[PDB]
Design a protein around this nucleic acid. Structure first.
Ligand SMILES: [Mg+2]
Ligand SMILES: [Mg+2]
Ligand SMILES: [Mg+2]
Ligand SMILES: [Mg+2]
Ligand SMILES: [Mg+2]
Ligand SMILES: [Mg+2]
Ligand SMILES: [Mg+2]
Ligand SMILES: [Mg+2]
Ligand SMILES: [Mg+2]
Ligand SMILES: [Mg+2]
Ligand SMILES: [Mg+2]
Ligand SMILES: [Mg+2]
Ligand SMILES: [Mg+2]
Ligand SMILES: [Mg+2]
Ligand SMILES: [Mg+2]
Ligand SMILES: [Mg+2]
Ligand SMILES: [Mg+2]
Ligand SMILES: [Mg+2]
Ligand SMILES: [Mg+2]
Ligand SMILES: [Mg+2]
Ligand SMILES: [Mg+2]
Ligand SMILES: [Mg+2]
Ligand SMILES: [Mg+2]
Ligand SMILES: [Mg+2]
Ligand SMILES: [Mg+2]
Ligand SMILES: [Mg+2]
Ligand SMILES: [Mg+2]
Ligand SMILES: [Mg+2]
Ligand SMILES: [Mg+2]
Ligand SMILES: [Mg+2]
Ligand SMILES: [Mg+2]
Ligand SMILES: [Mg+2]
Ligand SMILES: [Mg+2]
Ligand SMILES: [Mg+2]
Ligand SMILES: [Mg+2]
Ligand SMILES: [Mg+2]
Ligand SMILES: [Mg+2]
Ligand SMILES: [Mg+2]
Ligand SMILES: [Mg+2]
Ligand SMILES: [Mg+2]
Ligand SMILES: [Mg+2]
Ligand SMILES: [Mg+2]
Ligand SMILES: [Mg+2]
Ligand SMILES: [Mg+2]
Ligand SMILES: [Mg+2]
Ligand SMILES: [Mg+2]
Ligand SMILES: [Mg+2]
Ligand SMILES: [Mg+2]
Ligand SMILES: [Mg+2]
Ligand SMILES: [Mg+2]
Ligand SMILES: [Mg+2]
Ligand SMILES: [Mg+2]
Ligand SMILES: [Mg+2]
Ligand SMILES: [Mg+2]
Ligand SMILES: [Mg+2]
Ligand SMILES: [Mg+2]
Ligand SMILES: [Mg+2]
Ligand SMILES: [Mg+2]
Ligand SMILES: [Mg+2]
Ligand SMILES: [Mg+2]
Ligand SMILES: [Mg+2]
Ligand SMILES: [Mg+2]
Ligand SMILES: [Mg+2]
Ligand SMILES: [Mg+2]
Ligand SMILES: [Mg+2]
Ligand SMILES: [Mg+2]
Ligand SMILES: [Mg+2]
Ligand SMILES: [Mg+2]
Ligand SMILES: [Mg+2]
Ligand SMILES: [Mg+2]
Ligand SMILES: [Mg+2]
Ligand SMILES: [Mg+2]
Ligand SMILES: [Mg+2]
Ligand SMILES: [Mg+2]
Ligand SMILES: [Mg+2]
Ligand SMILES: [Mg+2]
Ligand SMILES: [Mg+2]
Ligand SMILES: [Mg+2]
Ligand SMILES: [Mg+2]
Ligand SMILES: [Mg+2]
Ligand SMILES: [Mg+2]
Ligand SMILES: [Mg+2]
Ligand SMILES: [Mg+2]
Ligand SMILES: [Mg+2]
Ligand SMILES: [Mg+2]
Ligand SMILES: [Mg+2]
Ligand SMILES: [Mg+2]
Ligand SMILES: [Mg+2]
Ligand SMILES: [Mg+2]
Ligand SMILES: [Mg+2]
Ligand SMILES: [Mg+2]
Lengths: 156, 124, 145, 63
RNA sequence: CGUAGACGGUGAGAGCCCGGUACGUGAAAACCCGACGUCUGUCUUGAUGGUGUUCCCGAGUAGCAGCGGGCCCGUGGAAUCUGCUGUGAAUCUGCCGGGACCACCCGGUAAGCCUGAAUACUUCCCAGUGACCGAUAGCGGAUUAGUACCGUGAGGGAAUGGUGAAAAGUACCCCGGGAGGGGAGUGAAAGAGUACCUGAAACCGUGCGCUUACAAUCCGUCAGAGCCCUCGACGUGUCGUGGGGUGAUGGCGUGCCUUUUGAAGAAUGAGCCUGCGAGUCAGGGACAUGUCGCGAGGUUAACCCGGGUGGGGUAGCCGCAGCGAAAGCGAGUCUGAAUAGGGCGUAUCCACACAAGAGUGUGUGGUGUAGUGGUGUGUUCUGGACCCGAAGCGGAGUGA
RNA sequence: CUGUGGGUAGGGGUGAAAGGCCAAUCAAACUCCGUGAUAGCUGGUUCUCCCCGAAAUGCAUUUAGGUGCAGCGUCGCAUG
RNA sequence: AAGUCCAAGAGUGCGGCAGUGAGACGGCGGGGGAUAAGCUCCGUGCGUCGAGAGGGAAACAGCCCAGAUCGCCGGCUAAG
RNA sequence: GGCAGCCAACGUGUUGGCUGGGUAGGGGAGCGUCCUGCAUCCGGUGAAGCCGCCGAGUGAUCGAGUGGUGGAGGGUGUGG
């Protein structure tokens, strides 16, 4: 009601009019007026303790290993030649599930570029792994360098 | 997220009017006048659901008193004699018999007078 | 076999939010304020108790000052040192910081509430009589800077 | 808007170790002539605030 | 097929149809930021380290007296800054700062001048995003929009989107002066014909079934005959663990919300419908209640690096010892002349000894102490803080 | 008396004086702004079920139609 | 000292939550009033209504009998 | 005959004893709407909205239950 345009003056007199008492043209009761409790631009960042996130990710990964959906691949596609079809054939031979998660080192670009277009497959760098993407996909695949770096960072 | 109010009010108001079908005037056409006397109607239903047992028992006893006086005995004497004889038949069945078998009442009044004591004013 | 489908909150971790004044079935016509009154309109000040002078108003103040130039230390227990040093030996500010008994920057003092049975060489700033006697009786040394 | 403590209460009230609120007795600023000495002796010193006003005061100090 | 499965349309859910998307390319001319060759300007009359002794370095200023402002500081014991008015200093054994005040020592040189980098803001332009709205919402304005209209004023301030796939928007005939309509045709549909998707409720009828013109009524409910329709077994209508619509006739029967001790009240509000309309929101804010991890440790803000929620970040925060105003002491502390008792605490208990049994206190040996953080809920604080509502107070402008 | 043309602006004007008039409004005009002025005052507060279940008392109040405390309520914990 | 002791959901302390502080009637003991009010002010381990459905006194909160989990075209009763 | 709360015994939820009127008010458990996440699915062989019939739940209601209009989007589940 305090931000709408105009109508800062009394619509009419108190007594003698016969109609109900009002105070502003832009009252929430009126049509075209303001809203009773208006929302404002805002944020919902929730801080979660590091043990909380690490423990949750560790539980998710432990369940994944228990269900036997973790694998090792030395390289996804041949170097200096991005080929989405080769990656598709490789993943089809390797597994038959609809969605597969692959962890690839940052410096490897050809594999990510080749696998980007396909929709049910997603690629994440080992430093960018998160619980939501772990839970979303059906199969999870580790590259050798990525798994080694992740294990070393965990143990350090 | 703004939730503008299309079906939520409509479902409940329609169920109110649908339950209120069969009245006169604004009663069966208008909501604000339906819910009020809808609740009044159902409150009347609640009250007279208890009142119905009383009214039926009243009619039942009235018919039994009629039959007893036709057979030349009073209601109180008939009931007292029946209790003395130890017959556990209830006013529903007595009333249906009075509608049905005066032979049944003839036997019943005979039993009642047989079970009736010698003197009704004895100190016992 | 857990999917994003198989995620549930802890039993009782979720309590329903109360919608007040959302129908006479649960909370109606008053919104938990009851009948008429200033509490039914806005509020009452916390420090206001009907006009009479509040308990923060008809009471004297505490005398004396706060001594803004106060020097602060932290006590370290002789029993705690004995428990954390079964082998014993020389102990210093860095050693206590590593052991996590006091803040790293904060200045340390000790007292002799506990008992000492292991030879411990103590380096500190302020020594009390009880801690001094405990150190001397335990066949050790404790020097103060 | 960080909650503001009550400056009046803080200058008058202080907290014990266990969370009790201890307070300094009233009726000693002036007019001590006719007050008996034994009246004052039971009157100086501190005491814990009664549980009746503890709830209201606890809201005052921490705001 | 895919280094392009973003997005719209085409007669219905299209990456294989197009607009197009990954990816490459490309400017004759012009504009803003980034290098590379005449020419211009300065000093190498100058420069670096070495032994005693005779007007300048910012003036009506610092400061002072009164009177006022702004730093938390509201003349309080009041430093520091500034201003109006009067007075008014030294040039280095000079000064003022070091929170009314100074002896010895301790740190900086006032009245002169400017200076990029971190920051705030977005009328405008570009590219995107949305558990933001979808025509009483969202900007007042999806359409003649600050238009119509009101007020000569400063000004106030509206309502009004959808045919269809495309206008293929109904040739022609007939009734009618036209408006309006019926066929014939268009179209999938004209129960889509421009008053045009879906078309409810209040609203106004028609036709059908039943009831009602001896009838005293918050209008309904509980019984309840008759009439009409329907479903099965049995014949022409009769029952059957029957439904439906009406209901003649009897019992009971004083609308709803407020505010009240008290309402059918002849106390308040509602003519009706369709929508709109009320405990919401931010903080390392605080308390208590469930939930999660670690544990004598629990943890981060701001901020740095990843088209991404991730990793770093020990500055702080809350309990781990309290007592006292305090110096200070410390499982004790304060009061006190005092083991002489008290107040507060030593998490709480069990067992062993001593006293009175003035109710419990006093010393030993054991199990040995639980808070912090986010999540959600109730309350509380400051914000307008559940919503609507006054005559009135101040500033700026418009009009005799 | 009247046409024309101008000047006097809100705590101000003007006022053969009535608290008259200043654009149908005047014991302080009108429009915007602070402004969601402020309300111990009135009204309203929308889905359902299950359990428990009050007071109209005392104290004090620039207080009596509000408020805070105590009793009366509910939920949990503890001695049972 | 006993009795309910598969619980009155009894007591006391602490913690989280708001309501109330406008009562009325009747029976008792009273003041004022004129032993007048449906009056006022008290007391009541008084009751009722408030915050209560049913029957009875024609209607009628407060009097009399009696505590509505739901249903039954079942029986026994209280006041009357 | 049925639902619901408390309690005792035993068990991997039956039996048995009580209670269930309630305004302000407290506590507990739920229905429905919009918008997102995902596993997936429905839908021109007719979705949503619109208007009925029959059923079922102790309630807010539900029916992946169907009839007439409509011609373009929605739903289960667990979450927020
Ligand atoms: Mg409105
Ligand atoms: Mg708006
Ligand atoms: Mg939140
Ligand atoms: Mg009827
Ligand atoms: Mg009141
Ligand atoms: Mg009210
Ligand atoms: Mg109140
Ligand atoms: Mg303070
Ligand atoms: Mg003194
Ligand atoms: Mg004396
Ligand atoms: Mg209290
Ligand atoms: Mg696409
Ligand atoms: Mg499909
Ligand atoms: Mg699409
Ligand atoms: Mg296309
Ligand atoms: Mg000052
Ligand atoms: Mg000063
Ligand atoms: Mg100088
Ligand atoms: Mg300067
Ligand atoms: Mg800068
Ligand atoms: Mg519409
Ligand atoms: Mg005009
Ligand atoms: Mg055709
Ligand atoms: Mg139309
Ligand atoms: Mg249409
Ligand atoms: Mg008729
Ligand atoms: Mg007749
Ligand atoms: Mg009637
Ligand atoms: Mg009736
Ligand atoms: Mg009657
Ligand atoms: Mg209402
Ligand atoms: Mg009144
Ligand atoms: Mg009342
Ligand atoms: Mg009255
Ligand atoms: Mg009337
Ligand atoms: Mg009146
Ligand atoms: Mg009236
Ligand atoms: Mg009324
Ligand atoms: Mg009134
Ligand atoms: Mg009216
Ligand atoms: Mg009208
Ligand atoms: Mg808070
Ligand atoms: Mg907690
Ligand atoms: Mg980080
Ligand atoms: Mg202290
Ligand atoms: Mg002393
Ligand atoms: Mg002592
Ligand atoms: Mg914990
Ligand atoms: Mg003003
Ligand atoms: Mg003028
Ligand atoms: Mg002017
Ligand atoms: Mg006069
Ligand atoms: Mg006058
Ligand atoms: Mg006038
Ligand atoms: Mg004035
Ligand atoms: Mg005006
Ligand atoms: Mg203001
Ligand atoms: Mg404004
Ligand atoms: Mg206002
Ligand atoms: Mg207010
Ligand atoms: Mg009112
Ligand atoms: Mg009860
Ligand atoms: Mg009062
Ligand atoms: Mg019980
Ligand atoms: Mg309590
Ligand atoms: Mg409360
Ligand atoms: Mg009173
Ligand atoms: Mg009173
Ligand atoms: Mg009284
Ligand atoms: Mg009276
Ligand atoms: Mg009375
Ligand atoms: Mg009397
Ligand atoms: Mg008397
Ligand atoms: Mg009175
Ligand atoms: Mg009495
Ligand atoms: Mg009341
Ligand atoms: Mg009654
Ligand atoms: Mg009662
Ligand atoms: Mg009665
Ligand atoms: Mg009962
Ligand atoms: Mg049981
Ligand atoms: Mg109940
Ligand atoms: Mg309630
Ligand atoms: Mg179709
Ligand atoms: Mg069809
Ligand atoms: Mg269908
Ligand atoms: Mg259609
Ligand atoms: Mg949907
Ligand atoms: Mg649904
Ligand atoms: Mg979910
Ligand atoms: Mg949910």
């Amino acid at each position: 009601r305090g931000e709408v345009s105009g109508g800062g003056k009394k619509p009419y007199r108190q007594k003698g009019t016969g109609r109900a008492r009002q105070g502003s043209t832009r009252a929430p009761q009126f049509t075209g007026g303001g809203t009773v409790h208006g929302p404002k631009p805002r944020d919902y960042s929730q801080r979660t303790p590091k043990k909380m996130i690490a423990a949750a990710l560790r539980g998710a990964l432990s369940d994944r290993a228990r269900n036997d959906r973790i694998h090792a691949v030395t390289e996804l596609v041949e170097g200096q030649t991005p080929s989405t079809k080769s990656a598709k054939t490789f993943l089809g031979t390797l597994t038959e599930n609809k969605k597969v998660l692959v962890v690839i080192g940052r410096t490897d670009e050809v594999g990510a570029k080749s696998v980007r277009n396909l929709p049910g497959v997603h690629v994440i760098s080992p430093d960018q792994l998160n619980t939501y993407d772990v839970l979303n996909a059906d199969d999870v695949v580790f590259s050798v360098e990525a798994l080694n770096a992740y294990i070393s960072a965990n143990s350090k | 997220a703004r939730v503008k109010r299309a079906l939520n009010a409509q479902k409940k108001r329609r169920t109110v009017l649908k339950a209120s079908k069969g009245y006169r005037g604004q009663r069966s056409r208008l909501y604000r006048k339906a819910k009020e006397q809808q609740l009044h109607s159902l409150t009347y239903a609640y009250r007279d659901r208890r009142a119905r047992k009383g009214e039926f028992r009243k009619l039942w006893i009235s018919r039994i008193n009629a039959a007893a006086r036709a057979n030349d005995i009073t209601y109180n004497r008939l009931i007292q004699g029946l209790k003395a004889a130890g017959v556990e038949v209830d006013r529903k069945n007595l009333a249906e018999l009075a509608v049905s078998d005066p032979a049944a009442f003839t036997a019943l009044v005979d039993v009642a007078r047989a079970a009736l004591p010698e003197d009704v004013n004895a100190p016992s | 076999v857990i999917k994003l489908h198989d995620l549930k909150p802890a039993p009782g971790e979720k309590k329903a939010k109360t919608r007040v004044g959302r129908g006479e079935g649960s909370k109606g016509k008053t919104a938990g304020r009851g009948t008429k009154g200033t509490k039914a309109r806005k509020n009452v000040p916390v420090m206001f108790e009907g006009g009479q002078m509040p308990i923060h108003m008809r009471l004297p103040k505490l005398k004396g000052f706060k001594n803004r130039f106060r020097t602060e230390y932290q006590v370290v227990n002789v029993g705690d040192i004995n428990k954390a040093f079964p082998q014993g030996g020389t102990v210093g500010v860095d050693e206590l910081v590593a052991k996590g008994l006091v803040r790293k920057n904060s200045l340390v003092k000790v007292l002799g509430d506990g008992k000492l049975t292991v030879k411990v060489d103590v380096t500190a700033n302020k020594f009390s009589g009880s801690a001094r006697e405990a150190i001397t009786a335990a066949g050790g040394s404790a020097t103060e800077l | 808007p960080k909650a503001k403590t009550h400056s009046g209460a803080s200058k008058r009230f202080r907290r014990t170790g266990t969370g009790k609120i201890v307070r300094q007795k009233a009726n000693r600023r002036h007019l001590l002539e006719h007050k008996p000495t034994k009246r004052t002796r039971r009157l100086d010193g501190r005491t814990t605030v009664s549980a009746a006003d503890n709830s209201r005061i606890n809201k005052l100090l921490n705001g």
